[PDB]
Design a protein around this ligand. Structure first.
Ligand SMILES: [Ca+2]
Ligand SMILES: [Ca+2]
Ligand SMILES: [Ca+2]
Ligand SMILES: [Ca+2]
Ligand SMILES: [K+]
Length: 299
């Protein structure tokens, strides 16, 4: 039954952010931020959205239906700052840190001067000291709790964390010692899940060894030669609008050497949608989905 005390000061990716009162008019950038506010029962605070990553989670459809901004995003990517400001926001809630730098909408200090708070999803901080190290489920719980505090939504945040933990509790790590390629896009040079993002978190959780684990980033290129030598037991396909799961199956099938891998010959594929690959509460839903598919797979 806690209610937030304002003014509230928080360190958010190394910027001091002070909230004089609960946010009322928020522009959310990326699906992660938009859906987190929907999930916390704060959809009515969303005055604009931009850079959405796909349809909302099915369980957020009824919240999204009450928020006109979800139906009319400002832009497919970053909107102009003028369009953002037209809605008289008190907060810009950015899924990626770059969006509130000079290379994005504007720097955070300049936005503060103009009367606009900024909040970067805590899971998305990129600098040393603030980047998850490593990303864990607790990183994501802490993000929910922090945003809940800012939005005076303490019970809602606790509920959301409890729901994520229940989903995770449904997963028993596979004990077969299997390895996996996490294949995002690319035919000439595959782009794969690296060792420091959601891909690694999810593979660790479901019990797959990531052949891309030595990549020190969320994603990286891996040559066909290196993939073939790694011999992944299972292949996770990210199903995105720009590279479908089927497209990647066809790439694998058509490759004159990778088509001879056991994983490819035996259709040992797991499929995850794009939005849960951005770290957030949906990532746990993605993990459940992959765990269920892996359970159904014989190898
Ligand atoms: Ca409103
Ligand atoms: Ca700055
Ligand atoms: Ca500055
Ligand atoms: Ca249970
Ligand atoms: K306010």
């Amino acid at each position: 039954r806690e209610a937030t005390t304002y003014p509230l000061t928080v360190d958010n990716c190394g910027t001091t952010a002070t909230f004089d009162s609960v946010p009322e008019r928020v522009v959310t950038l990326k699906s992660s931020t938009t859906e987190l506010l929907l999930a916390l029962g704060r959809g009515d605070r969303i005055v604009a959205t931009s850079y959405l990553d796909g349809p909302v989670a099915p369980w957020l459809e009824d919240e999204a239906a009450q928020v006109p901004a979800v139906s009319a995003p400002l832009d497919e990517r970053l909107p102009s700052l003028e369009k953002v400001l037209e809605t008289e926001p008190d907060l810009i809630f950015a899924g990626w840190e770059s969006m509130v730098t000079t290379e994005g909408l504007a720097d955070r200090d300049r936005l503060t001067q103009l009367g606009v708070n900024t909040l970067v999803a805590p899971s998305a901080c990129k600098e040393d000291g603030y980047r998850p190290d490593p990303l864990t489920w607790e990183s994501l719980a802490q993000e929910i709790t922090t945003v809940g505090t800012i939005f005076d939504a303490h019970s809602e945040a606790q509920s959301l964390v409890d729901t994520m933990n229940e989903q995770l509790a449904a997963i028993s790590p596979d004990s077969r010692g299997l390895s996996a390629l996490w294949f995002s896009s690319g035919s000439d040079t595959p782009f794969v899940g690296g060792g420091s993002g959601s891909a690694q978190l999810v593979m660790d959780t479901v019990g797959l060894r990531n052949i891309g684990s030595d990549i020190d980033d969320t994603w990286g290129p891996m040559s066909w030669e290196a993939i073939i030598d790694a011999n992944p037991d299972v292949i996770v396909l990210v199903d995105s609008s720009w590279s479908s799961a089927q497209k990647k199956k066809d790439i694998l099938t058509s490759h004159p050497v990778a088509s001879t891998l056991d994983a490819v010959v035996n259709d040992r594929y797991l499929v995850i949608d794009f939005p849960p690959t951005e770290p957030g509460v949906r990532t746990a839903d993605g993990a459940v989905a992959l765990a269920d598919q892996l359970a159904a797979l014989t190898v």
